[PDB]
């Protein structure tokens, strides 16, 4: 309740206002000591200081980070990042132990798992899946209203401070058919602690079992069985995965794979429903449905898929048309698959056949064995794209 998130809009407004006042004092002085009626605003006003200030803020700062392109999950968790650093936060040397900790009010607002390790831990924690910002800048999370003993389907958004004087049930608590709890003494949490409360005492219920972990840690299967440290390790190495030339589906997943694949803009999604008319390895032509296309404009959709291009981590991006001729598509349907995805589902690595057994020490402590069969069939071989730039300057000679 005492910490507020500033998004790009607020810093943009602040820098714009700074440049505005900086140019405005000068133009006010010039107008006061200059012409009175025979002058135009355009020549006396200036634009270069404002443009320079805003461009410098956008292109050079400790908070305008460098986008990572090695993985759709990497970019989604980078766009969903919350940082306590930058011009207005706190430094690494003067950061106390207590501001690097999980407060009991992070349940449903900030992921307690995904967090970079090393010098800056607990400062760059990301926010959960259902967390959304408030009008004043506070963090707000969904909940399900319970009137007396029945859960109302209508959602209700709660801020941080408002949660303090309430009692909130748990999603895993069973409901019989219309919210009637199986036990009249249901578990709950009221003020930074957990206890057991009566059925009639509860009034709010959490929406689901997923608003605790972020997107980066919600695709680890069977997360409720492994240690928190190992969960963090898995989340990080899942973030840092590199795409293969031919992604394969995960045999065991979570169901958020489609959401992460389609919400991110890497993959091509059908903007308007219709039927396909001509497929190609580089472009897609879609015959839009007659009843859907508005009158006046009677054209058809064109999707110009991108090809091998240099990325911030030198990995390759190439969309693959995952459709055929003469098959219907819907609005918001997946038409092409980018890197590390297939059929509109996230796919980061490969599903190997593994056995747990010591073997002559070649897997001594953490090392791994690989059969020569997998390197025959190139199941893990990757493609990297490098840029070489040569400039032609002019010296004195």
């Amino acid at each position: 309740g005492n910490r507020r998130i500033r998004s790009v809009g607020e810093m943009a407004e602040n820098q714009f206002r700074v440049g505005l006042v900086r140019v405005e004092r000068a133009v006010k002085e010039r107008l006061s000591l200059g012409d009175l009626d025979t002058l135009m605003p355009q020549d006396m006003i200036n634009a270069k200081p404002i443009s320079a200030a805003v461009k410098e803020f956008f292109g050079s700062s400790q908070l305008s980070q460098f986008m990572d392109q090695n993985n759709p999950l990497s970019e989604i968790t980078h766009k969903r990042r919350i940082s306590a650093l930058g011009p207005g936060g706190l430094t690494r040397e003067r950061a106390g132990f207590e501001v690097r900790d999980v407060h009991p009010t992070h349940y449903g607002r900030v992921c307690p798992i995904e967090t970079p390790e090393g010098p800056n831990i607990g400062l760059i924690n990301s926010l959960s899946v259902y967390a959304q910002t408030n009008e004043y800048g506070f963090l707000e999370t969904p909940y399900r209203k319970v009137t007396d003993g029945v859960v109302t389907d209508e959602i209700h958004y709660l801020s941080a401070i408002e949660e303090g004087n309430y009692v909130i049930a748990q999603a895993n608590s069973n409901l019989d058919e219309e919210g009637h709890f199986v036990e009249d003494l249901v578990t709950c949490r009221s003020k930074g602690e957990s206890s057991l409360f009566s059925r009639d005492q509860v009034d709010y219920m959490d929406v689901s079992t997923q608003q605790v972990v972020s997107v980066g840690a919600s695709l680890i299967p069977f997360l409720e069985h492994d240690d928190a440290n190992r969960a963090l390790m898995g989340a990080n190495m899942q973030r840092q995965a590199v795409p293969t030339l031919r992604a394969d589906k995960p045999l065991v997943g979570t169901g958020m794979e489609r959401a992460v694949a389609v919400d991110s803009g890497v993959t091509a999604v059908a903007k308007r429903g219709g039927v396909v008319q001509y497929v190609d390895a580089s472009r897609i032509v879609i015959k839009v449905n007659e009843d859907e296309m508005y009158p006046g404009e009677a054209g058809i959709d064109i999707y110009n898929l991108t090809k091998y291009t240099r990325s911030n981590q030198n990995t390759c991006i190439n969309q693959m048309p995952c459709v055929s001729l003469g098959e219907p598509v819907e609005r918001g349907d997946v038409l092409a698959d980018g890197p590390s995805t297939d059929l509109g589902e996230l796919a980061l690595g490969q599903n190997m056949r593994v056995a747990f057994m010591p073997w002559n020490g070649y897997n001594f402590e953490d090392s791994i064995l690989v059969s020569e069969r997998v390197v025959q069939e190139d199941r893990f071989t990757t493609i990297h794209i490098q840029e070489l730039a040569c400039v032609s300057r002019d010296t004195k000679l």
Partner: protein, 1338 residues
């Protein structure tokens, strides 16, 4: 090329002798050409030519006149390296004063003159005049003057009035006065003086001047008159494009000062008036000030775009300074870096290398190998030949690889084994294949950690790498006592599976000829790996002097044990491998071998262990699955009971019977009890799962579950992890420290609620953050240990001293933690060891107790043998070999020369990673009761009650061994007596946790010598039900009433103040504040009856850090440093005074004693020499200064050992003690004779001065000093060598101090020798210097 460094000030004639010419003009280069001026700053005649073997005019062309001068250009035709070294000088018409001594905070000019620096600066920059006997009677030589006073005195005397100006006046005054009469007069002044503020300044001045006269430097030499010029190479001027230059900052100031000199010379060429003479002299003065140290006073840069220039000071110190950033931390070639992997087919002295890295590293050696064979012709030919990677290149590279060890080291080289050597083995790939076992030394897992490979070049480096660096020599860890080649994670489980025994398997119950048969039965699949066979074996024993006698028998064992016994060496008993060989055993295994057969059998045996363990772990198969983790069925039922009782406790709070705190404690306690019960149930279920029938009925035996195999064998995991996997994970605590009241009731195998997981999140985040932030503070600590203990080099073999007291095993209240066996092992005795048999000497003096003399101690029940310690040594800046003890890295005793301080620093710094950041006496054993500090009297019940607060009790075994120790507080009754044989489980003392105060004689209590109501208050409370007597303090009671220190008058039937008969003092005992007396008036009191009742560890890393720094605690426990009978003082505005009354000597002593905190000191306390007064933490300072030097040693070593044992880390006590010998490196002179009166300086220097003085000056008292300590932070600043001091802190100050004092550096350290580039005299360099002095300069 040398072995000592002497630094002192320079004389003008010798400065000119350094020079080779005189510079006239600053034109470094002429226009329209590129020839430096023949008479300018860059002068060939002064410095040298810019062309090799050629003169400026080039009439002598590098064939006829090498080394001889040229007629046109007066420079010897030679190489350019002389230009690098040749230097010149500049003669100053007006002498100037050096500025550092002016700018130093301890101003040497001011200290030697006894005037401040403000007036000196004014007379130096020509703002005030200086009198030089202007008048014989009016004023003196050491007064300042002004222009108006000068004119007034000029008219006054004129003829005798002389007063010069500036630096020439300063140096004239400095030279015209002597220093002898000054030194004697100052010695007499300090001899008869009273003040202390000026006493320190006067002592500093007299020391400075007595060193100055001894230094041989004349004071007037400090005021320089000729300035040397740096050789031109240090101020390069590269010609940039269009005739431009780099604009060296040195050349700018050189031009400025030379222009000032030329202008002054022109000014004095026509006898200019003094009005403009002063201005020019002043300008030259700031010119030389700027050149000598720019920006210190006036910041007169005037030569840049508003930025300072580097004149001299910027290139002495600073990070941009080259000293500790260019000889401490730097780049290096002939190295590579890459990821690691596991090569489980290599020997201990082998590491893999990728072919590409191998060829890249060894290409310079390839060319030499190639050109020798004649395949190539030129370097280009060899390079293009190896570029194609032909056939011969691989075989010649494999030839040169065979004998050329390479050094591997991880990035964080925490301790001595960070850098190891190996013989390379060429393989394909791009990873450093490493031996598994050695990876325990590096502490390097295989999750992507990188290592770097280096390569020695010379024969010296390679030979020393083979001798020392190689892993086969560094078997034993230098830390405490144990090998680093203990079998690692995977192999241990393989060996554990090798040696087990089921109750029934294929091929059991028969017999085999020997271990060879067991191999064939198992390999052919006819018998199980573990069975119950009876095999016949033959082994050997070392009973004879090197002769292995053989014996054979029929030892019942299992099949696998014979397979294991196949690979063990000759001389080991078979009893070692009968038990189920876990993890700690195998290490002990190796230890046994290391102490019977040597080194090569041990290393080959360890290699065989690794191979067999890997092979039979692969062949066995050990997987983990859901069916392998069994959940105890009772566990669920258990929670119900807990839940039920939890609800019960809730009802207790519901009715108000219990409050919040006690309910919380009860619920957490019952939950912990439930956790204990479920953990025990799960352990019982796992341990005995297996039930296999053997010919009918079913029999139970140890389970073969994989999880239990991992847990029991010690390969990985422990009881905690297995408990978490199946049983309760355990109740977690909030990060602030509070423990939550709802424990997690589910294990990892079962599901976890979202709250339970969320609650368990921040429990691990705190630990992860602590580990992440611990890599800086802990490692930094090692630095503060390296600098203080940098040298500590063993120099000579034996000194002959025999000091040291009471090296005994430590008892910590309960059972003994470590015996005498490991505490004294590795040390050499000094006193003769007396067997407890009335002079039947067992171990002679001056013998190394390795194992055999240790083997002679357990049967004699010896418990107190003192050995010679490092602190009790009296050498010169070193330690004796026969005093440090046996070296821990190798089996034999310490060698000669090798460093110990760095070893100790690294050994104490390594366990930092495993070091975290944030009423009655019960007997447990059987033996006799003994009491130390025997001071007790018979009580009213006939038992014993003590009157001395510092009494301690110890249980003694029937053989005289001490097995228990218990501090006995004041007023504690005794339930037994000394010498009574009492077993365990019987209390012997009882005391209240209020402290009662008890009398000593029988009789009535005539309550006199107190004021009723004022001192004693009739507190007729309803609880006690009587008018109690409360002796309130001065603040609690009336100030006037509390003005007599009331004492109860215990009387006999006569009603008189009966005394302790004739000996000490009457029965009047001064009752302290709040002396709660339940007696009313005149109640009969027997001897030993109560009188009244007084109503009376941080984290490991901070504890170590502030213990080594010797920081004073919050409340230092005051101590009585004098004997006699203690008394009570008076009362003041603050802490009450407390006077002591020793029975002899200088008795009138008192001190400032706080009264709010507890003071367990009374009038009737016959205190002794070195007994504590108050309670609480004690700083090492008082302990060192009052109760002996050995007392501080026994304190901090015990504290740090307790900390490390709490952290589960054990280290040897030699490492902790040696830095102590370096920590106590200073002393304070009490009696004069060597220093002046109180010069706190090196204790070793004073001791060696006194020892030689007594030989010649027999009778002189010398100096009865007191050896005082100093924190490591302060100890690093007081280094004897000035190079180490100048390395990092205040380089300008220490350089000036060494220059004026004529300091001589013998180069006794290691960092200082690294600084100057000479070979370090710690390792093989020490033997080089000793052999260097023996042959040459003998």
């Amino acid at each position: 090329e040398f072995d000592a460094i002497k630094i002192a000030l320079a004389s003008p004639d010798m400065i000119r002798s350094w020079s080779f010419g005189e510079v006239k003009k600053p034109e470094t280069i002429n226009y329209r050409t590129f020839k430096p001026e023949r008479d300018g700053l860059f002068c060939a005649r002064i410095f040298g030519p810019v062309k090799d073997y050629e003169c400026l005019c080039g009439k002598y062309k590098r064939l006829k006149h090498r080394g001889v001068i040229c007629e046109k250009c007066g420079v010897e035709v030679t190489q350019t390296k002389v230009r690098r070294e040749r230097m010149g000088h500049i003669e100053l018409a007006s002498p100037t004063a050096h500025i550092w001594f002016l700018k130093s905070l301890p101003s040497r000019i001011g200290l030697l003159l006894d005037m401040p620096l403000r007036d000196i600066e004014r007379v130096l920059y020509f703002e005030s005049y200086v009198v030089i006997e202007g008048g014989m009677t009016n004023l003196e030589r050491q007064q300042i003057l002004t222009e108006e006073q000068y004119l007034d005195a000029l008219e006054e005397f004129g003829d005798e009035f002389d007063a010069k100006m500036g630096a020439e006046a300063i140096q004239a005054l400095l030279k015209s006065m002597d220093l002898e009469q000054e030194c004697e007069q100052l010695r007499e002044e300090l001899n008869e003086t009273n003040s202390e503020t000026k006493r320190k300044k006067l002592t500093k001045r007299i020391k400075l001047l007595e060193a100055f006269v001894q230094s041989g430097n004349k004071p007037e030499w400090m005021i320089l008159t000729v300035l040397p010029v740096l050789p031109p190479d240090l101020r390069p001027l590269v010609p940039l494009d269009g005739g431009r230059f780099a604009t060296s900052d040195l050349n700018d100031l050189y031009r400025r000062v030379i222009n000032r000199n030329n202008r002054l010379k022109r000014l004095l060429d026509l006898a200019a008036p003094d009005i403009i003479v002063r201005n020019e002299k002043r300008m030259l003065q700031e010119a030389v000030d700027a050149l000598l140290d720019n920006g210190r006073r006036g910041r007169a840069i005037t030569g840049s775009n508003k930025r300072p220039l580097k004149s001299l000071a910027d290139m002495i110190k600073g990070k941009q300074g080259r000293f500790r950033q260019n000889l401490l931390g730097k780049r290096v070639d002939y190295s590579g870096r890459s990821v690691i992997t596991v090569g489980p087919y290599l020997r201990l002295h082998q590491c893999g290398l990728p072919k590409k890295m191998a060829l890249e590293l060894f290409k310079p050696f390839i060319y030499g190998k190639l050109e020798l064979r004649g395949l190539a012709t030129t370097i280009k030919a060899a390079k293009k030949m190896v570029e194609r990677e032909e056939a011969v290149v691989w075989d010649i590279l494999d030839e040169v690889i065979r004998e050329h060890p390479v050094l591997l080291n991880r990035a964080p080289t925490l301790h001595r084994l960070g850098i190891q050597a190996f013989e390379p083995v060429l393989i394909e790939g791009k990873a450093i294949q490493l031996h598994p076992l050695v990876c325990a030394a590096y502490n390097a897992d295989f999750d992507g950690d990188q290592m770097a490979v280096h390569v020695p070049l010379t024969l010296e480096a390679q030979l020393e790498a083979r001798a020392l660096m190689m892993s086969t020599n560094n078997i034993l860890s230098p830390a405490n006592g144990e090998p680093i080649i203990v079998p690692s994670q995977d192999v241990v489980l393989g060996l554990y599976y090798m040696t087990r025994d089921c109750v029934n398997a294929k091929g059991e119950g028969m017999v085999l000829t020997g271990p060879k048969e067991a191999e064939r039965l198992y390999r052919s699949g006819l018998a199980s790996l573990h069975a119950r066979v009876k095999v016949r074996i033959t082994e050997y024993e070392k009973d004879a002097n090197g002769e292995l006698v053989a014996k054979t028998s029929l030892k019942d064992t299992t099949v696998g044990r014979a397979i294991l016994w196949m690979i063990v060496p000759k001389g080991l008993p078979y009893s070692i491998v009968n038990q189920a060989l876990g993890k700690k055993a195998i290490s002990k295994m190796l230890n046994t071998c290391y102490r019977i057969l040597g080194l090569k059998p041990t290393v080959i045996f360890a290699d065989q262990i690794m191979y067999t363990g890997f092979a039979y772990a692969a062949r066995s198969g050990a997987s983990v699955g859901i069916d392998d983790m069994v959940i105890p069925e009772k566990k669920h039922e258990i929670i119900s009971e807990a839940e039920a009782e939890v609800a019960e406790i809730q009802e207790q709070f519901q009715s108000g019977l219990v409050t919040a705190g006690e309910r919380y404690n009860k619920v957490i306690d019952i939950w912990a009890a439930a956790n204990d019960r479920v953990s025990k149930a799960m352990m019982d279920n796992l341990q005995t799962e297996t039930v296999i029938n053997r010919d009918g009925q079913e029999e139970k035996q140890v389970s073969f579950n994989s999880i239990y195999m991992m847990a029991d064998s010690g390969a990985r995991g422990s009881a905690a992890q297995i408990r978490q996997l199946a049983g309760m994970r355990g109740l977690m605590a909030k990060p602030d420290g509070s423990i939550i009241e709802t424990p997690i009731t589910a294990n990892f195998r079962e599901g976890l609620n979202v709250l339970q997981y969320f609650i368990s999140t921040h429990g691990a985040r705190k630990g992860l953050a602590d580990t992440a932030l611990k890599t800086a503070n802990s490692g930094y600590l090692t630095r503060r240990l390296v600098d203080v203990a940098q040298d500590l080099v063993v120099t000579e073999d034996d000194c002959g001293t025999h000091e040291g007291i009471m090296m005994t095993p430590v008892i910590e209240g309960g059972d003994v933690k470590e015996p005498l066996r490991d505490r004294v092992l590795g040390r050499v005795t000094a006193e003769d060891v007396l067997k407890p048999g009335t002079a039947d000497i067992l171990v002679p003096r001056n013998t190394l107790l390795h194992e055999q003399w240790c083997d002679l101690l357990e049967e004699n029940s010896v418990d107190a043998v003192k050995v010679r310690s490092v602190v009790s040594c009296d050498t010169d800046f070193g330690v004796c070999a026969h005093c440090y003890g046996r070296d821990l890295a190798r089996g034999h005793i310490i060698n000669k020369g090798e460093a110990i301080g760095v070893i100790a620093a690294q050994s104490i710094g390594e366990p930092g990673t495993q070091l975290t950041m944030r009423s009655s006496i019960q007997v447990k054993n059987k033996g006799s009761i003994k009491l130390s500090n025997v001071k007790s009297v018979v009580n009213s019940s006939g038992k014993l009650v003590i009157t001395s607060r510092n009494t301690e009790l110890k249980l003694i075994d029937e053989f005289g061994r001490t097995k228990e120790s218990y501090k006995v507080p004041y007023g504690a009754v005794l339930a037994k007596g000394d010498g009574e044989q009492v077993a365990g489980g019987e209390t012997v003392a009882n005391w209240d946790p209020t402290m009662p105060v008890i009398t000593e004689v029988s009789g009535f209590v005539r309550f006199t010598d107190m004021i009723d109501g004022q001192t004693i208050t009739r507190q007729t409370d309803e609880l006690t039900g009587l008018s109690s007597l409360v002796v309130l303090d001065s603040a609690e009671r009336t100030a006037g009433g509390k003005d007599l220190r009331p004492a109860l008058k215990i009387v006999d039937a006569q009603g008189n103040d009966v005394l302790i008969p004739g000996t000490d003092m009457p029965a009047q005992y001064f009752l302290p504040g709040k002396a709660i007396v339940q007696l009313e008036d005149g109640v009969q009191i027997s001897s030993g009856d109560t009188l009244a009742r007084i109503p009376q560890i941080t984290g490991g890393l901070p504890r170590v850090a502030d213990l080594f720094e010797a920081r004073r605690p919050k409340e230092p426990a005051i101590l009585a440093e004098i004997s006699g009978i203690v008394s009570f003082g008076k009362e003041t505005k603050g802490k009450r005074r407390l006077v002591i009354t020793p029975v002899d000597g200088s008795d009138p002593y008192e001190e400032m004693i706080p009264k709010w905190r507890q003071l367990n000191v009374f009038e009737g306390e016959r205190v002794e020499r070195g007994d504590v007064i108050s309670d609480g933490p004690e700083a090492p300072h008082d302990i060192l200064r009052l109760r002996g030097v050995h007392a501080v040693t026994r304190y901090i070593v015990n504290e740090v050992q307790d900390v490390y044992r709490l952290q589960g880390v054990k280290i040897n006590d030699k490492h902790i003690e040696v830095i102590v010998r370096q920590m106590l490196r200073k002393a304070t002179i009490v009696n004069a004779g060597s220093s002046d009166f109180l010069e706190g300086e090196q204790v070793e220097y004073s001791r060696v001065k006194i020892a030689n003085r007594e030989l010649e000056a027999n009778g002189k008292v010398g100096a009865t000093y007191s050896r005082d300590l100093l924190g490591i932070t302060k100890a690093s600043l007081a280094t004897e060598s000035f190079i180490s001091a100048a390395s990092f802190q205040e380089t300008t100050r220490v350089l000036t101090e060494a220059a004026v004092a004529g300091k001589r550096d013998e180069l006794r350290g290691l960092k200082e020798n690294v600084i100057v580039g000479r070979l370090i005299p710690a390792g093989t360099g020490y033997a080089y210097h000793q052999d260097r002095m023996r042959r040459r300069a003998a």
